[PDB]
Design a protein around this ligand. Structure first.
Ligand SMILES: Nc1nc2c(ncn2[C@@H]2O[C@H](COP(=O)(O)OP(=O)(O)OP(=O)(O)O)[C@@H](O)[C@H]2O)c(=O)[nH]1
Ligand SMILES: [Mg+2]
Lengths: 164, 349
């Protein structure tokens, strides 16, 4: 009944494509680095989410802003185990949140790869990304493991509930 | 739609009544327009331009003014940029829904794949104002599928990735090395070379086995029977499908369980199926009134039974096409164009 366009971005290797197809096909697919985008429509309760999975390689990150049209929600996916790049993730998140086109978008952060041994937890990702500083933004952070699917529908449920 | 009306007003103003015949040089081919057509250029050369303008305001500016070809190119870039921004995600969603519905129906085709790379959007980002390279791209993809039939992996996939990469480079040139900038430009001038010396006009080499036109023009179902023909199994089938103003490709490659049937519309992307039935379903519904109706949007003509037909279907000779050299004095073949780099190992600026 309600269509909602979702932009899913994050650094390369975050898990974005894995999440998309875990949600859509119920499977773990063998992925390669996405140079381009994938898109799927995922029906969940009242809502048709069209989810845009856009490549996160640094050399194609400038293209992200070409996918902002009529977007109601932003999914930012962070590799919880990548401590070296978490401040880079934060920089990329904040650049997106600066865009006037996205000023009303709800933000769901997936703190992904919680199964890996040196994974920062949700509270720590929340501080590293500066989420508490986000004023005038409906946001939420969900700990996930894409490969098992743990957390993904909890994430989606929150997002659906915000968008209704 | 306001957009459709405005985009048609804009279109009329590019083919104007000062040279009525669709025989005079179109302004989109001219060096001046093409120099004009790029980002961040209207603000330098077009009086009254403002970047906060709507499409309609830009089209008003276009049609009310007295503009050089270069000024027209800059405005065309700004109008087309915004128009594509409004439409391309809607369109992609639509193509993907049809793919996924067919792939997922009955017995799932687990090997079905889709890769979207809409040319108009990538070429606008690449500051290429010619208005489309469906013919060059369709030919390159058929060469890629010849190469993949013979055992190379992911050649068409990487062509399409390189369109994205070139668009990233050309839209934001200061973030990449001089070498990357030159690479991106060289990819695009290769498409232009292919258009300038089109191998279908080349009589010294025959890149085609058969041209099916006029009288024996094929319907969509005719393309389906040719692609999915089991008599072929083992060997590649490589077709270029020509609407009046747009080229596409379709193929079969691989043997037994690795056999795949694919379709490339440069305006959308590539789909491949392992199921012949599903490939036939996709193509029928892609073109068919009952579904996406691309037969109407590409303005295909009709036969006497009123079924949509392609102006031309070319049954390609892939090994010969692969070896074709689009520019006299340069050894680079169609296969070499496929292999052109865009990114290289230098860290991003
Ligand atoms: N251990 C573990 N591996 C994961 C998880 N999620 C994704 N992966 C793996 O991490 C790798 C990268 O995943 P992708 O989904 O390709 O990452 P991406 O975000 O789409 O990367 P780009 O396409 O470059 O933007 C793959 O090998 C995935 O299987 C997870 O939760 N745990
Ligand atoms: Mg990916």
């Amino acid at each position: 009944k309600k269509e909602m366009r979702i932009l899913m971005v994050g650094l390369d290797a975050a898990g974005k494509t894995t999440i998309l197809y875990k949600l859509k096909l119920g499977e773990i697919v063998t992925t390669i680095p996405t140079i381009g985008f994938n898109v799927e429509t995922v029906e969940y309760k009242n809502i048709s989410f069209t989810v845009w999975d856009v490549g996160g390689l640094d050399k194609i990150r400038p293209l992200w802003r070409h996918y902002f049209q009529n977007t109601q929600g932003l999914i930012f996916v962070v590799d919880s185990n990548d401590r070296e790049r978490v401040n880079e993730a934060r920089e990329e998140l904040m650049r997106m949140l600066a865009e006037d086109e996205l000023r009303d978008a709800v933000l769901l952060v997936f703190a992904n790869k919680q199964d890996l041994p040196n994974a920062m937890n949700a509270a720590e990702i929340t501080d590293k990304l500066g989420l508490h500083s986000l004023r005038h933004r409906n946001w939420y952070i969900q700990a996930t493991c894409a490969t098992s699917g743990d957390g993904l529908y909890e994430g989606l449920d929150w997002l659906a509930n915000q968008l209704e | 739609m306001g957009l459709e009306k405005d985009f048609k007003r804009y279109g009329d103003a590019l083919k104007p009544d000062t040279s009525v015949p669709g025989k005079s040089k179109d302004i989109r081919t001219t060096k001046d327009f093409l120099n004009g057509y790029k980002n961040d250029h209207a603000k330098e050369i077009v009086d009254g331009f403002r970047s906060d303008m709507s499409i309609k305001q830009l089209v008003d500016l276009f049609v009310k003014g007295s503009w050089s070809a270069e000024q027209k190119g800059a405005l065309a870039w700004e109008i087309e940029s915004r128009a594509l921004k409004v439409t391309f995600q809607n369109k992609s969603e639509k193509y993907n829904r049809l793919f996924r519905e067919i792939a997922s129906a009955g017995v799932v085709d687990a090997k079905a794949t889709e890769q979207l790379a809409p040319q108009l959007m990538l070429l606008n980002l690449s500051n290429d104002g010619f208005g489309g390279r469906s013919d060059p791209l369709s030919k390159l993809v058929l060469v890629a599928k010849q190469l993949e039939n013979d055992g190379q992996v992911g050649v068409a996939r990487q062509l399409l990735e390189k369109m994205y990469s070139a668009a990233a480079v050309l839209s934001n040139p200061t973030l990449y090395s001089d070498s990357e900038n030159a690479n991106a430009s060289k990819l695009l001038s290769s498409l232009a070379a292919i258009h300038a010396k089109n191998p279908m006009h080349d009589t010294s080499m025959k890149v085609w086995q058969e041209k099916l036109e006029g009288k024996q023009a094929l319907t969509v179902n005719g393309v389906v029977e040719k692609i999915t023909d089991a008599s072929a199994n083992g060997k590649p089938v490589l077709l270029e499908l020509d609407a009046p103003g747009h080229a596409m490709a379709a193929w079969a490659k691989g043997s037994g369980d690795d056999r795949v049937y694919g379709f490339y519309d440069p305006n959308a992307g590539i789909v491949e199926f392992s199921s012949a039935e599903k490939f036939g379903d996709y193509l029928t519904r892609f073109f068919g009134k009952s579904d996406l109706n691309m037969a109407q949007s590409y303005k295909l003509g009709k036969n006497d039974a009123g079924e949509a037909i392609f102006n031309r279907v070319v049954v390609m000779d892939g090994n010969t096409l692969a070896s074709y050299k689009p520019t006299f004095g340069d050894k680079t073949t169609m296969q070499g164009i496929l292999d052109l780099p865009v990114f290289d190992a230098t860290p991003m600026k």
